[PDB]
Design a protein around this nucleic acid. Structure first.
Lengths: 64, 67
DNA sequence: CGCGCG
DNA sequence: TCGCGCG
């Protein structure tokens, strides 16, 4: 199973599981926030833990 | 008969005076010299002053100068 | 405008 | 590549 330190990481993961790959502004807005900056530190931390991947060209995030 | 340049903020006048006497210098140096902590404390102001042609930045050294 | 950086 | 100025 994926290991989440904060429940909000699961919220991101499930959003991407449910809706396919999306940019950080979409993850943020879907979860009640505004911009990529509201979630990017979480996304890159999750990427470092092989929870998510990002396509560097489209900037879309997806589950790992 | 007013002095030149005119600065809209004390911060801008302080940056300009620091660079006139010491410059060029990196943003991290300017931030510390004005009692702040990192480049993030002055970058918004430096690029705004650059857009008004009050300062320039050397791309190679990253040091800011009075224009 | 990508920015992940405390 | 800590470059980053971004609201």
């Amino acid at each position: 199973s994926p290991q989440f330190s904060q429940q909000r990481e699961e919220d991101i993961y499930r959003f991407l599981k449910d809706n396919g790959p999306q940019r950080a502004l979409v993850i943020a807005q879907a979860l009640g926030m505004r911009t990529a900056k509201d979630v990017n530190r979480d996304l890159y931390r999750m990427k470092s833990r092989h929870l998510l991947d990002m396509d560097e060209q489209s900037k879309a995030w997806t589950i790992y």
